[PDB]
A paper describes a structure:
A key resistance mechanism involves the addition of 4-amino-4-deoxy-L-arabinose (L-Ara4N) to lipid A, mediated by the bifunctional enzyme ArnA. UDP-GlcA subsequently undergoes oxidative decarboxylation catalyzed by the dehydrogenase domain (ArnA_DH) of ArnA, a bifunctional protein that harbors two distinct enzymatic domains, yielding UDP-4-keto-arabinose (UDP-Ara4O). Subsequently, UDP-L-Ara4N is formylated in an N-formyltetrahydrofolate-dependent reaction catalyzed by the formyltransferase domain (ArnA_TF) of ArnA, forming UDP-L-Ara4FN. Crystallographic studies revealed that full-length ArnA assembles into a homohexamer.
We therefore optimized specimen preparation by employing graphene-coated grids, which mitigated preferred orientation and enabled the collection of a larger dataset of particles. This approach enabled the determination of the apo-ArnA structure at an overall resolution of 2.89 Å, with markedly improved map quality compared to the initial reconstruction. The hexameric core is stabilized by extensive hydrogen-bonding and salt-bridge networks among the six DH domains, which are arranged symmetrically in the center with threefold rotational symmetry. The six TF domains are arranged radially around this core, each tethered to its cognate DH domain via a flexible linker. Importantly, the map resolves the previously unmodeled interdomain linker between the DH and TF domains (residues 304–314). Taken together, these observations suggest that the flexible interdomain linker (residues 304–314) provides the structural basis for the observed heterogeneity and serves as a molecular hinge, enabling interdomain motion and coordinating the movements of the TF domain within the hexameric scaffold. In contrast to these arrangements, our structural analysis supports a DH-driven assembly mechanism in which three DH-mediated dimers form first (A1–A2, B1–B2, C1–C2), followed by association of these three dimers into the hexamer, i.e., a trimer of DH-mediated dimers. In this view, the A1_DH–A2_DH interface exhibits stronger and more extensive interactions than those in either scheme 1 or scheme 2, including hydrogen bonds between A1_DH Arg418 and the backbone of A2_DH Glu411, A1_DH Leu451 and A2_DH Val453, A1_DH Arg472 and A2_DH Pro455, A1_DH Tyr477 and A2_DH Glu407, A1_DH Lys480 and A2_DH Arg400. In contrast, alanine substitution of Arg472 in the DH–DH interface (R472A) caused a significant decrease in activity, and the triple mutant ArnA(E407A_E411A_R472A) was nearly inactive. In our cryo-EM structure, we observed substantial chain-to-chain variability in the angle between the DH and TF domains within each monomer (hereafter θ). Interestingly, relative to the crystal structure, the cryo-EM model adopts a more compact overall conformation with smaller DH–TF angles.
Numbering used by the authors:
A (entry chain D), B (entry chain C): 1 to 656
C (entry chain F): 331 to 656
D (entry chain B): 441 to 550
Write the structure that this text describes.
């Protein structure tokens, strides 16, 4: 009596009708909200089910343990599924403790993804059918119960196909239910020995390249025929779609280029001859080929290029606003190793970018974010990617002048962001790792962590709250006004361009400079017992690689994300008491090389352990969106970073 | 080739199937893509015709004189129509001696309106049908040939009834094609003269009223049944669509809102009782009443918020720039006579709107479009409809100094236009009748006439070109950035409160004012050698009614449109105008007003006109988009307008 | 606050607002000077009257709970940009500002008692578009503090904790603002409906009568001995804690005393015990809402006096007597 | 007009719904504001109309469709690619071309 059915389309509707005729009460149906606008040529299942009285639930929190307990309490005995999200779910894979039956309409276990029947028709196969198998913990690890073979008629039409599908469904439902119910499944094993990936299911968008065989073109044109999105191509300033063609006897000795008939439209290809019956003018309806053939006026000898090269991918012009900064220069020296990239910048110097003088693609104006507002106004109109990598906030500055962390680090950025919304550009806004403040979470996740700041009377959380509100108004702009954006959070990046030189008296600014002075100046301070702090550092190379992948945006899958770019696994307790420095102090020169002394007085002098100025827990990030939207994972460890930094810093002071 | 067909919708598709099956060779069908056609069914026509290789045509815009000439030059004798809306019938049908045949889907001629299915189903009749009829000099007054009878049942649903109607129509066509081919139709004289006009169907009046009987509710629920969006109210914070009902004892004594039983959900009403089995919450899932009731945390007994439906009516705010002018102060007196209108305003004076300053919703703020630009920016952001009725373009002004007509009538209007494109607001921009210039068309068409101007050395065409380019900028903004607009062209609006220069631009010529001023004293009515100027005038009442209909946008029929508001059939020369003016001036009193001695019979004086050497003879508006989009036709004749203007001038002269 | 100021002689009020619906009693006062308008196009008026007056109160707060999730650009541009503009008029002309902060700056603060000098402010991740209001107001307070530290700006910040009383209709409460606890319950009371349709005593929702809060704000305005400048004062009732069910019970008990004509019949309605798919889905946030009056009891010498029963009677009297069918 | 006179010929354009005349009108209002400026502000100007200037070193092949619709460029493309020239209506339509070296000697004289 207890049975769960996920039904869809006409076969699902008739299955529901048959089950009600037999009188089995479906336990529960879990479906999602219907899309507002879609080609709904089928009937409305939800309304019919409501008339039948079957309850419908919409789980807001499928991750919730409560709903899992509910599903367990329901005691799922027998579940049938009919094209419901193909392999039901992916992340959980636990909803089938006793197993379930999945009916698929493709050649399992290969051809993974969406629209499987269309894709197997793309390759031009003459064999289809249905595959039933048990649902276990490992995906596609159930033996095929039965697999019938139905021939694909060369002249098959849609109505005959519908009648054949109905006949097959009737044959299945009439007297095959007892066979499945009895338990004649002989599952032993499946695959698990080859595991050979053919092509990793390359999308290849929908470009109609003529180099591709004409047979494949006919196949996917029929596959994407009505009702489906269909092929959509555009050459020059004119777009065209191939909506309907009929196969014709392909010639071998055809003498391509000799058009003997323009009506109907017949052009030559790499192999064979395709006869396109009807197509659509894009901004209209289906039209006969002969009229378009007469309208275009093409004559023998005219060759259609395989790629229009009208807009192509242009240049992907990138606009940086901190191009002389650490990240600003390390990203400029990486974007210029490619070909499809233009770079800009308006920092207040060119000391770290003197290397780039007259490369094919680079520009430099050397202005100010406040004074030079028209240049930025026009350059968030010409470019397509904006990286406001500019910020003037010394840790001291929150006490010297807290209003400089607002009028410059919040309002200039706010003005820049309002440029990307009035021109509909993309902005990769650099957030900070201080937004979380003193979050107690072990892993500073970017999606479900609580940003904790101090009281209003502490004049040091204005930077963190300013950046947090900047991210919030970026998110609101993105989700209300159609702003493509991507926040990214650097996590203690360390490269050999950290603070240039100490000309600006940055020695007493922060301990990050005392680390530099540790190796050169005589500093008898090495006996720190870790400080109970997990100093997670990341090399600049990995961060720049991640930022490059963010800029690439492979398939528009980095939009509206808050990726953190760090190395949560590369921790270092006080540089391992100088272990690698013991191996790297030998180098080559002997000047200034003297063995250090020893001694330890107090931990208090080194670091501050106050109430207001304290980061509770540690600073280890959580890279989850980085591993998905970039498929990126850190490779460089602390040793190479330390030696490279020391070597570069030694070379940047020459001799004296 | 004969018998071209205007078909559309699924009935049109099946009629195409029928004519193809019968062997009747029709080579031309008319259909419209209909972008606002977001119905669940795509309703695509001629697909099978395209697949069969039949050469068909797809003419989108029939009213273009090119298509008219092509469809007229072959001179056919039969034009078939099958559920083709957008009638706007014209001379093309009158050309054919045999006329045209149109198939209406209701029992003509009683209560035809628009969407006649609602009209026939609201009255709870027991028999409906279709009617193939002729075309006449009137609108939708074709003779009935036969009356189909298949009857209706309360249990019968929309799907079954529509399928039966489709099959019956198929058989009817298949058996009557010989009948129409051989004619012998016996149409009887119809009673079209004694009919009912001036009434339409609007969804806005379909609110749920408890006092209506259960019969009317049952009727309009079945009328809007599936497949259709549904007729729903707007209660506080819960959506529901009436899908199904069950006949229950019509004796609920309790007041509306009381739930008699929760399984199934049955509510009480003022009369009868509706049983809502299921409801659709907006765009999600059509789900049952009980589960929805338990989902929203409401219990049995929860009454509804009486007659107020949440927030009914919002009082759309109209931002009129130039309220003290001739059109601004006549429109305000018209918008303030109704509800749901919260008029705003800004001009340099309030001498003519002095009667609205104490109105609950007038909000007049004195200012100038230049100095007070932030006020305009804010009020274009808060309001909904913007009417820039500011004119500083006296002919003397833009001839003596065209730089002002540029910096004021192009650069100030362009700013207001660009306010509505960033705040996404509707703008009804007043164009001018001067755009056509020296056009050589009898009727100045809004979509087909050419705009002719003189050479650049003539600075008298700068105003016309400036306004024409202003229309081309608005048109390009609603085609590239989605801007809702409606250009209207005042064609010689005449009425009271027409000052000398204050209404010489947005109003009309000073003719009537000149003769009245010369008539209050003994000055003559001296004519001109070209006294037969043949000037057509429009009453301010008719123009304001048309502009109010434009503001309403009843069914989004005025969107992206250009409408001339004029009276082309109100032609009158200066002599006739003077005759009627004198006749109305003598009237009953005949006293004071000075002796009206006037008249001259030579008045040659050779010539004294320098810029009068060129004059236009074609100045007739083509009012068809007005009677296609707002269904407006001028009513007031010239004598009434003359009398009203004279009476206003004589009572408001304020003399002794 | 205007009616409290216009009874104590030496006070010249200058009010700006879009309408005079609830202040019709003061336009005939010799020292009221009301002006009709909105703060988007009155920049000159506001600037001139900041330069002219001595104390400035930007009580203009347009923050609907729905507006937190709907088009929060409006929330940011009206509750942060105009407030920022007004704050910078008070540093140009060296004027005092009494800024209304919000009790929502603490957010999910774990502390039982919300201290304004020691407690932490906790907010959710950036993806949830509901905390933009709290962060905007917190940044406004931090900017005011920075201005009163670097520019010598005389300021005071006050945080209201669920003030209730007569005339609470404006745009938050009342029929128009149906998204509210008290007004929805009282509307369900007025019209015969199943009152107390809840499945158990909810969190203790403390309320403060408007009279005590207005007294505290008046003492802030007085600035006796200048011991209130440079402070953040919490104005609330940490002792008037009451659950929703207890509130309904006491309101019904007060109704029982002189129930007019017994023309409003209360009712009850049963609901599914399981309450599957309901409001509670992880929005517990905090369960205390306890303010700290330790700052209002040291700077204002203020201690709340009016208890819950008098507040309920006052609000009910106003609601049932001032309005009628229209 | 048979001959496009610079001070007597009338300028005719299509309706607003035809968006191809927005370039003719934009450049026609620019000549009417230069004329207006030269009458009330004493601006020294000269408005030259190059009709069909054609010559060597024209626009290079770019991201658009062979630069622009230039008629002659289509013919050169057909000659280079060996495409037969489509004789539409047998070449009845004429075109009056001007050499760049001839119109440049007039621009320099201006």
């Amino acid at each position: 009596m207890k049975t769960v059915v996920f039904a869809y389309h006409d076969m699902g509707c008739l299955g529901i009708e048959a089950l009600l005729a037999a009188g089995y009460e479906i336990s529960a149906i879990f479906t999602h909200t219907d899309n507002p606008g879609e080609k709904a040529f089928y009937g409305s299942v939800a309304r019919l089910a409501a008339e039948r009285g079957i309850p419908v639930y919409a789980p807001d929190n499928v991750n919730h343990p409560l709903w899992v307990e509910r599903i367990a309490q329901l005691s799922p005995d027998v579940i049938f599924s009919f094209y419901y999200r193909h392999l039901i779910y992916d992340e959980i894979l636990q909803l089938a403790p006793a197993g379930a039956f999945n009916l698929h309409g493709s050649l399992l276990p290969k051809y993974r993804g969406r629209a499987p029947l269309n894709w197997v028709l793309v390759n031009g196969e003459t064999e289809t059918g249905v595959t039933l198998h048990r649902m276990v913990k490992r995906a596609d690890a159930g033996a095929i119960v039965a697999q019938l073979r139905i021939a694909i008629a060369p002249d098959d039409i849609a109505i005959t196909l519908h009648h054949k599908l109905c006949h097959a469904a009737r044959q299945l439902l009439e007297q095959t239910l007892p066979a499945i119910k009895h338990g004649n499944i002989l599952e032993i094993a499946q695959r698990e020995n080859e595991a050979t990936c053919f092509g990793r299911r390359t999308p290849d968008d929908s470009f109609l390249e003529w180099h591709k065989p004409a047979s494949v073109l006919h196949n996917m044109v029929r596959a994407v025929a009505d009702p489906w999105p269909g092929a959509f191509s555009y050459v020059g300033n004119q777009k065209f779609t191939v909506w309907s063609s009929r196969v014709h006897p392909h010639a071998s000795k055809a003498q391509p280029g000799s058009v003997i008939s323009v009506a109907p439209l017949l052009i030559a290809c790499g192999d064979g001859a395709l006869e396109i019956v009807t197509g659509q003018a894009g901004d209209g309806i289906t039209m006969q080929g002969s009229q378009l053939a007469q309208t275009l006026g093409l004559v023998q000898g005219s060759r259609l290029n395989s790629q229009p090269a009208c807009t192509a991918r242009r240049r992907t012009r990138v606009l940086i606003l901190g191009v002389n900064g650490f990240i600003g220069n390390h990203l400029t020296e990486r974007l210029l190793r490619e070909d499809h990239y233009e770079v800009y910048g308006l920092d207040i110097g060119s000391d770290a970018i003197s290397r780039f003088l007259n490369h094919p693609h680079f520009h430099f104006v050397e202005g100010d974010i406040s004074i030079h507002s028209e240049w930025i106004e026009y350059h968030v109109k010409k470019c397509d990617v904006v990286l406001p990598l500019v910020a003037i906030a010394t840790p001291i500055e929150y006490t010297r002048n807290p209003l400089r962390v607002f009028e410059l680090d919040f309002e200039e950025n706010l003005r820049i962001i309002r440029y990307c919304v009035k021109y509909r550009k993309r902005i990769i806004f650099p957030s900070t790792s201080e937004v979380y403040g003193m979050c107690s979470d072990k892993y500073f996740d970017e999606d479900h962590s609580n940003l904790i700041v101090g009281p209003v009377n502490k004049p040091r959380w204005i930077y963190s709250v300013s950046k947090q509100l900047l991210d919030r108004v970026i998110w609101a702009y993105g989700e209300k006004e159609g702003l493509q954006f991507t926040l990214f959070r650097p996590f203690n990046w360390m490269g050999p361009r950290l603070d240039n030189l100490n000309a600006a008296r940055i020695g007493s600014s922060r301990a990050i400079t005392q680390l530099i002075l540790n190796l050169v100046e005589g500093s008898p301070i090495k006996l720190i017992d870790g400080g109970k702090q997990k100093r997670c550092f990341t090399d600049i190379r990995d961060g720049i690689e991640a930022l490059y992948r963010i800029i690439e945006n492979a398939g528009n899958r980095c939009d509206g994300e808050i990726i953190n770019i760090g190395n949560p696994e590369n921790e270092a307790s006080i540089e391992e008491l100088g272990e690698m420095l013991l191996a790297s102090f030998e180098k080559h020169p002997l000047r200034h090389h003297f063995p250090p002394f020893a001694g330890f007085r107090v931990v208090e002098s080194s670091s501050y352990y106050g109430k207001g100025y304290q980061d509770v827990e540690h600073r280890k990030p959580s890279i989850r969106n980085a591993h998905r939207c970039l498929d990126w994972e850190p490779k460089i460890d602390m040793q190479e970073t330390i030696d490279e930094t020391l070597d570069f810093f030694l070379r940047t002071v020459d001799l004296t």
